[PDB]
Design a binder for these strands. Structure first.
Lengths: 38, 209, 71, 122, 176
RNA sequence: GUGAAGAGGGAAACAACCCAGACCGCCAGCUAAGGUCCCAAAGUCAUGGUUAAGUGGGAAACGAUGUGGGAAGGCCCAGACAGCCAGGAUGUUGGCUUAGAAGCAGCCAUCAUUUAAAGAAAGCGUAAUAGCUCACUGGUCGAGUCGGCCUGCGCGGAAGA
RNA sequence: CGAUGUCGGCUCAUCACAUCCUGGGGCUGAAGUAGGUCCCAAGGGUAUGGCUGUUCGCCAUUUAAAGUGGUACGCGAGCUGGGUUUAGAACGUCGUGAGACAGUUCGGUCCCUAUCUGCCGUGGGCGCUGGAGAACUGAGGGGGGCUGCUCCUAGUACGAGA
RNA sequence: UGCUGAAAGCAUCUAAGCACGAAACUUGCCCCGAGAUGAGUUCUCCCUGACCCUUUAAGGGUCCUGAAGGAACGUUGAAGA
């Protein structure tokens, strides 16, 4: 899984949920959008 | 349950029909005479001293003679104490024979291996030899470069060095028994076991899971 | 915690947790740490010989016999 | 030992006249070949009616060795020379149409059934 | 929490038996149903069961909300029960589960053959559907996680065991 | 200024940093640098204050209602933000273009009807559709809650023999 | 500067971890077979021949992978001396010329009788505080770790067939 | 990676709770270990009398009374520099 420093407002449709103590980003308004950051 | 002390008398082959050779080790097991049973007004644990031998009447010493005197007028040369598991033993019963293996024919064997003196630096440690020509001389079987420059800068533990070798304990867990004869003191086992002819060993019914 | 220790075999090192130390080394986890705060020189060994820590509420001193230290 | 640069005689019909082995095949860091091994081979002399030429590279099966076949009954099934049959790498089986002599009956046991029907009386 | 205004009243047909280790709940759709909330203390009465702070235990006003969350689901579990969430999509798959025995064909060298937790049974009402009979909301979920483990639904057909997520999508598989 | 052209040390150990600067002692007082939970001599001293992490005891653009300080602002008791409910229609099978399009391929109108309330549509998804999201209003819920900025302290981005 | 052997070989090895293989997880223009490609994990594993001193490269062929780097680009009181290199020769370039040339090719001697640290085996002396003979515990200490080929599961699943 | 579920009445694999998860970690598997002064245990064998001279943990003698077993001797070894 690729690693980044932030998610930087990439799409407003994202809820930015915490799962198991880390952020999990998922989106419907942008394809292939998956991020472990908030 | 317990173990037996024997005498390794050689190796041979017994075949099958029409072929396959079936190599087998030949062992003689004179019935182990018993010297002591514990948890019977002696010690807090269940164990038997199985003993084999008798020594010579003008060579046996007082501290050994008086240690076998509870069991008889012969110094049985050793105790061989085994703790009891999945069974029982009492102070009355026949001297322990190869009928221990009448139905349990998978065993494990403990004994000392390769009693062959010093061997040699390469004959022991399986090194790669240097060039016999091409300008190389004086070095061929010496142990080699024993480390590396400055940073670790020391000789390691768990490495290969010369000394007096062999006659140390090995345990074999995959063995099947081919035949036993309690009336002729015979044990016949498939394949090979540690130590040369005359070796004593320990043979036990298998307890491995 | 980590409790790093050199076994005497080159870079060979052991590590533990405080959970593991009380689960399988409860008499030794204090023994390896108190010696580093005894006096310097031969008096350190002379005080360490008096330490004798036990766990599981049972000792070899039932006729000496150790009484409770109180204020 | 049958290994790199070992020269073998062919039991292949109208086959190659001088052939030499390379590598060993069958396993990682493998040592040496014997009866029932297939090895990579090179042509040095082909004979004028050969359909291969010098420096062509093939495979061959070892059918006899001067060390023989082991473990029948504790003895050994002995032979006097190292001999092979060249194989077709594109179509499998021998490169020729027949085989010279009975070769070895170990080819009838388990693994070489498509070879003992081509010509061998075994 | 802000939920203690609605402590949930015991409905006519449900019984709760009071014990200092594991309290049990009984109803006509759930028997031998267990509750364990050791981070809190109860106050049980002939028509109510409420949660309060436990002696020597530290809690940031949350553990009685998580304890009420077990009471919330057990009252409906023992009186009505829960929805079916296991169905096979593929046409080449079949099920025949009954009681405490699982027979399920999903294209594997084994008919799944599961031995289950206690207080749950399974039945097939059709050749492609599985219904779990039980009143513990965690057990009927965890058994469904174990049963859906064989052949995941793929974006190219979806033929596995049916599931929902907001990111469920089809793929066009555009080739050659 | 200090060493190279002085002692004493202290900072864990460097010449220089920090303090001191040598005539010599004294079972005498008072101090500087630095130390006072323990190893190791002396406060786990007393006041409130910021951080929540083994940070302190390495690593940036970028980014964040992580945590305090502060002024203005949106939503707010004819009632708030999340959740639950009602929904999110009707004129309408539109009109011009073209072979054609059930809001969501161009431009043309964007009005009126209804209702607590709205668009033949801000953003996805799809066939050209479908299926969703968003605007927005009251019932339930309810007293504080949130975005943006200025700033103090921590945080993530992240490997080495 | 009153000395510190430098690229290569043979032999003896070790550390890192930005993971090549192995054990796993995940995205995908993941249909399937594959590839593209990232992160948990450093316990184990990881190249032969023709040319060249080759480090490197060019080719040929194997393999569970043919991973990267540290360590004075590891191990000449370790052995070697193929390369770098004087003393000889010759072709070129330069110079009036002697001579110069990291231009080129050829050729070119390697010292040794072991204190203390390190490491293997093995004694005496002393320690266990009455002595002599045998058997036994356990503060601690090391060792190990797979992988091709093929068929049945299956030509089933998947896909327009392959 | 999931089920149940919260502080935050929603949400979420985590806070409580339960279901798993690799050759790595732990157990199992083989060997070494009382220089373990921090010298553990069990059995067998051997030893339990006095006195002179001396202000003496320093000995110099006498009568009475003691070794278990080792070392030595070799002949030798499948022991060994």
């Amino acid at each position: 899984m690729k690693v980044r420093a932030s998610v930087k407002k990439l799409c407003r449709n994202c809820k930015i949920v915490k799962r198991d103590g880390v952020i999990r980003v998922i989106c419907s308004a942008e394809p292939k959008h998956k991020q472990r950051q908030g | 349950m317990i173990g037996l002390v024997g005498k390794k008398v050689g190796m041979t082959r017994i075949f099958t029909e029409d072929g396959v050779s079936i190599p087998v080790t030949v062992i003689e097991v004179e019935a182990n005479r018993v010297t002591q049973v514990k948890d019977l007004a002696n010690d807090g644990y269940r164990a038997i001293q199985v003993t084999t031998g008798a020594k010579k009447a003008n060579r046996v010493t007082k501290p050994e003679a008086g240690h076998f005197a509870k069991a008889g007028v012969e110094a049985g040369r050793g105790l061989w104490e085994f703790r009891l598991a999945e069974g029982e033993e009492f102070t009355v019963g026949q001297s322990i024979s190869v009928e221990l293996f009448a139905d349990v024919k998978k065993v494990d064997v403990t004994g000392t291996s390769k009693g062959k003196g010093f061997a040699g630096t390469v004959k022991r440690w399986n090194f790669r030899t240097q060039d016999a020509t091409h300008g190389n001389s004086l070095s061929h079987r010496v142990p080699g470069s024993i480390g590396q420059n400055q940073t670790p800068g020391k000789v390691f533990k768990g490495k290969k060095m010369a000394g007096q070798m062999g006659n140390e304990r090995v345990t074999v867990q995959s063995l099947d028994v081919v035949r036993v004869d309690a009336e002729r003191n015979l044990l016949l086992v498939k394949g090979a076991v540690p130590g040369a002819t005359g070796s004593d060993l320990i043979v036990k019914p298998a307890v491995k899971a | 915690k980590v409790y790093y220790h050199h076994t005497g075999h080159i870079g060979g090192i052991k590590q533990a947790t405080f959970e593991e130390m009380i689960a399988r080394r409860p008499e030794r986890v204090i023994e390896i740490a108190v010696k580093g705060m005894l006096p310097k020189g031969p008096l350190g060994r002379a005080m360490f010989r008096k330490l004798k820590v036990y766990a599981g509420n049972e000792h070899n001193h039932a006729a000496q016999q150790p009484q409770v230290l109180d204020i | 030992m049958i290994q790199e640069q070992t020269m073998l005689n062919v039991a292949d019909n109208s086959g190659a006249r001088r052939v030499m082995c390379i590598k060993v095949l069958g396993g990682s860091h493998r040592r040496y070949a014997g009866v029932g091994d297939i090895i990579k081979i090179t042509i040095k002399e082909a004979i004028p009616r050969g359909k291969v030429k010098k420096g062509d590279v093939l495979k061959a099966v070892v059918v006899r060795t001067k060390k023989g076949v082991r473990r029948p009954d504790g003895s050994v099934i002995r032979f006097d020379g190292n001999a092979c049959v060249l194989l077709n790498n594109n179509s499998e089986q021998p490169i020729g149409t027949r085989i010279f002599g009975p070769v070895t009956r170990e080819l009838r046991s388990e693994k070489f059934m498509k070879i003992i029907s081509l010509a061998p009386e075994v | 929490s802000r939920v203690a205004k609605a402590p949930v009243v015991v409905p006519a047909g449900v019984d709760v038996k009071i014990n200092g280790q594991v309290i049990t709940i009984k109803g006509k759709n759930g028997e031998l149903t267990r509750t364990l909330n050791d981070a809190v203390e109860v106050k049980h009465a002939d028509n109510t069961l409420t949660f309060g702070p436990r002696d020597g235990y530290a809690d940031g006003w949350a553990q009685a909300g998580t304890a009420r969350a077990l009471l919330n689901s057990m009252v409906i579990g023992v009186t009505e029960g829960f929805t079916k969430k296991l169905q096979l999509v593929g046409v080449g798959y079949r099920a025949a589960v009954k009681g405490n025995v699982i027979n399920l064909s999903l294209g594997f060298s084994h008919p799944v053959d599961h031995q289950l937790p206690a207080g749950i049974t399974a039945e097939c009402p059709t050749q492609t559907e599985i219904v779990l009979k039980g009143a513990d909301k965690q057990v009927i979920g965890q058994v469904a996680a174990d049963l859906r483990a064989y052949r995941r639904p793929e974006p190219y057909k979806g033929k596995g065991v049916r599931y929902a997520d907001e990111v469920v999508r089809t793929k066009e598989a555009k080739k050659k």
